[PDB]
Amino acid sequence: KPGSMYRNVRQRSFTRRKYMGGVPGSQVIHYDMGDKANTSFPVKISLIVEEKCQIRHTALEAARITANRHLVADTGKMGFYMKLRVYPHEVIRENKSGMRRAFGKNVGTAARVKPMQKIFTVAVEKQNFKAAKEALWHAGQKLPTPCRIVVDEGAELVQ
Amino acid sequence: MYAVVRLRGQVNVRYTIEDTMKMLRLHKVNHCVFVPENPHYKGMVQKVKDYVAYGKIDAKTLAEVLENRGRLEGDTRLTEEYIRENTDYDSIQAFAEAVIEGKSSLKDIPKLKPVFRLHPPRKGHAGIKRTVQQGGVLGNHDENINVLLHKMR
Amino acid sequence: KSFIVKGKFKAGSTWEKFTKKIESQNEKNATDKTYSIFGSKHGVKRSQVQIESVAEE
Amino acid sequence: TNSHGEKRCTRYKLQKTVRERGISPVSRAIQEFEEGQMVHIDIDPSVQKGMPNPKFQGSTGKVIGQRGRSYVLEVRSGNAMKEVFSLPQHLKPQKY
RNA sequence: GCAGCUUGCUACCUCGAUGUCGGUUCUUUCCAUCCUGGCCGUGCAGCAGCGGCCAAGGGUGAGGUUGUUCGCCUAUUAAA
RNA sequence: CCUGGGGCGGGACGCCCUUGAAAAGAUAUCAAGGGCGCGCAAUGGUUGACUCAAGCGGGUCGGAAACUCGCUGAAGAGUGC
RNA sequence: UGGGGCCCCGAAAAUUGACGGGGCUCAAGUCGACCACCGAUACCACGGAGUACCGCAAGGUAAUCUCGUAGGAAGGCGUUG
RNA sequence: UCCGCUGGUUCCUUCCGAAACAUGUCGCAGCAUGACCUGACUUGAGAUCGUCGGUGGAGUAGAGCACUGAUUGGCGAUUCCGGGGAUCCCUCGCUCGCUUGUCAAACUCCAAACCCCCCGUCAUCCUAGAAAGUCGGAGUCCGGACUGCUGGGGUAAGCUUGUAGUCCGUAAGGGAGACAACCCAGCCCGUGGUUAAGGUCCCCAAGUGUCGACUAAGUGUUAAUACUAAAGGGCGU
RNA sequence: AUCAUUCGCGAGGAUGUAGUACGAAUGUCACUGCCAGUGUCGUAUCUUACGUUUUGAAGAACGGGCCAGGGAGUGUAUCUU
């Protein structure tokens, strides 16, 4: 089931779970990675999508896994903080006869994100900026939208 | 004094915009009307901004338009003799200066038509798919409406 | 016949400053060449180029 | 399927603002209108009696008579003239 | 993402009929190349493999079951 | 009869509410959420008197499962479905 | 290091074929502007026809009259008696 | 015989000119009634397709978490209701708040632009007859398309089903290679001129036009359109 | 048109010449013996028949080989206008 299926935004939101039935649970477990308690990380980069798309929970989990692995390998287990800002709120449904009564059954969840919306934010120290940037590029390679990294804090600390 | 000259025809126009055109008496392309500067006419011109070119006309351009293209009932051409016999002004230039200054009115010419059916613009205009601010001809020409009126004589 | 044209232009999503040095006949010619150069180099229309100043250098 | 009741699609039509729910100001219920006066129809959801159809909410009617407590109004609906009966609790005078 | 060679979806053309599957005969085309030609890597000593690139000039057969397409099996074969 | 051919399935075949429906009105689909084919001499009318849910503190094997006191409480209750 | 323009790789289909074709490289492509010209039955002018309304008539007005399927209305042509 | 089903139905000009929609129907290839077209008459002074200002309706977009529900950590407490191995000797998930991070067709403390009723105003039409009324004759209830509404549904569809405007249907002529509906334009006949869209190297009327740059790939030489290949990468420029 | 002056980086623009010479046409005077029309062919532009079913017809949707003739809203009763 390719991500190109539930990728384009052509429809209203579908999120009120009390009027639907049986949504499969999301695959994404954690939303905060690295050192969750510390907030005094000087450099703070983020990954913003540049198109209006829907990102499935499996794509979110894949990007989170790759970014977390890269960050843990490079900066260490507590050398970074990672926050996945968006939750999969939209309910993705599928039409499983033909086209009679084609209103689909709920098959998953997705986050409906807007252009320039932050998806992941990574806070690190000065010397770990390139490792965080490389990991976040790897994470963006798993998403169904073109992405760009932006520096939120520490611009003068990097250059 | 707004000068409003229609540059786009009636096919594929909303009925509201076309009725605004009819109320301004602009039924055909290259037809021009002169209206006062009140907010009513301002709103009508803003409504029809996408099918006309408009601006502030000066007395010289008004005089030339009146002389070359003003008509009377029965399709008679305005003349200085008619102007002097039916108005207190000596010449068409003085009458147009009075009209621009606001101390006279085109309705002060008996049997004169409110529509001036101008020639097509010599050497073309800027184009009817873009506005003045985009390099086209549609919309607000300000005082440069007189240039288009001069080339449409 | 050298001019310095300072301004800012929209490069996609972000505005960018510039202080270009231009060889031209006069100041308005330099402004026209600035607009043409930025249209060529970035595909931006003259509404997307804001020439703050032109000064003989 | 969709019904054809009077209260069709009245969820927000027959709502009150947050800080006007409850007993409405009673002054609006004892206001008298003259013949030919123009009055708006702004239905009060708390007054469950005398209420015209919500289709005429937001319309200006002309008072043409009185039928007890209620007023008879000539109201334009598309191209027809309707006689709408309304208690003054749902009515409101036009200000000139 | 590509193709439209599987199956679906749809109902735009054809119901004053465009003869329906498979095989046979004959011609042609594509390359995403099975062999044949030229290359590169190799955890390539040689023999022989594995992976990839170019290349459509030629070849790509004979048989048992089954209407079969497909598939299974047999013995040849550079490959079938 | 409807029907993304027909059939099977179903009834969107009568009535009522929300969304769809694009802040007047109207608006389709085998569109989404659904409900109704009833119950009640009181579960009805009127008058009087009161104020609910839920928390906090006090009160005896009356246990953090009762009842009662005080404080908060525009309603988070109740109003048959 | 970031943000941009154009181009390249990614990029494989079946008769010989499609920027319309030829062809075109400081362009005959793209981007930002500009100049002149060509080019309708549009618009202007003249003449003419019909139409609508008015007018006893003569005639007057028409920028606000002149496309048209289903279809309505009016006036005419033709055949035989 | 009958059929709601198929085929045909013969001269000219002139004036006007639709609907492919709603409800009911053993209704769904039909019909009735209404909307829409046309003709005539009566009546006799207003009407509103447009503007501007004002009195009113907003609950859509957007925004937001104040309600209803979702939703992510950090921090502080519920000495409460509860998961773990006799003084319930001590471990602690939910629950309730202060901060972070996200949401909603069927949420709203907020809240547009359109739009709608009414009042005034200008504007247009109107005694050569407004609005209104009465009557005669119908056609029509297979529609389709483009541009928006992220319209709904759908993986999508030159798919299906809505809505506003405009078109084809019933629309010439000019231009896009051809093009029902894309651009100009609505078109009585003849002549002359100037333009619109689009184009100006040849085919083909007019530029081998000007200025400033880019492209080396024959990339491109393709307004819209379903007739135009993506993610990713490039010390190509 | 040509030329003069001026502006513009440039292609070109503006002013004057010039609303001039010309110009649809309307009259008039000479000259001429053809013209209109018809058949066929050529050059230039345009057009994929007709009727029908159709949202959409040049259709690879239906109908006609051709020509002549025949070939389709009529009467009674009743109602309305």
Q: Is the CB of A97 under 7 A from strand H?
A: no
The resolution in Å comes to 3.5
Q: What is the dihedral of CA C19, C25, C31, C35, to 10 degrees?
A: -90
What are phi and psi for residue B113, nearest 5 degrees?
-80, 140
Is residue B69 within 8 A of residue B149, CB to CB? The reply is no
Q: Which nucleotide is nearest to B21 (CA to C1')?
A: H50
Nearest to B35 by CA among B24, B46, B27, B43: B24
Give which of A1, A11, A32, A145 is closest to A90, Cα–Cα: A11
Chain B: touching chains (3 or more CB pairs < 8 Å): none
Sign of CA dihedral B76, B79, B81, B84: positive
Contact by Cβ (8 Å): B29, B152: no
Round to a whole number and report the distance in Å from the CA of C17 to the C1' of H100: 36
* Nearest to B136, CA basis, from B57, B51, B59: B51
d(CA A54, CA A144): 8
How far apart CA A76 and CA A94 sit, in angstroms, is 41
Nearest to B127 by CA among B141, B140, B137: B137
Q: Kindly report the bases of strand F lying within 7 A of a protein C-beta atom.
A: 3-5, 9, 12-13, 15-21, 24-26, 28-35, 74-75
Q: Give residue A13's Cα distance to chain centre.
A: 18
Give which of C29, C49, C54, C30 is closest to C39, Cα–Cα.
Answer: C49
Among the residues of chain A, which ranges form H helices?
Answer: 57-75, 129-140, 155-158
Residue D17: CB less than 7 A from any atom in strand H = yes
- The 3 state secondary structure assigned to chain B is CEEEEECCCCCCCCHHHHHHHHHCCCCCCCEEEEECCCHHHHHHHHHCCCCEEEEECCHHHHHHHHHHHCEECCCEECCHHHHHHHCCCCCHHHHHHHHHHCCCCHHHCCCECCCEECCCCCCCCCCCCCEHHHCCCEEECHHHHHHHHHHCC
State how beta strands B52-56 and D91-93 pair: unpaired
Residues B78, B71: Cα–Cα separation, whole Å = 6
- End-to-end CA, chain C: 8
Measure the CA–CA gap between A151 and A149, rounded to whole angstroms: 7
Q: Count of CB atoms within 10 A of residue B141's CB?
A: 20
Coil vs helix vs strand at A16 = coil
Q: Are strands A147-153 and D38-41 parallel, antiparallel or unpaired?
A: unpaired
CA distance A32 to B122: 71
A75: helix, coil or strand? helix
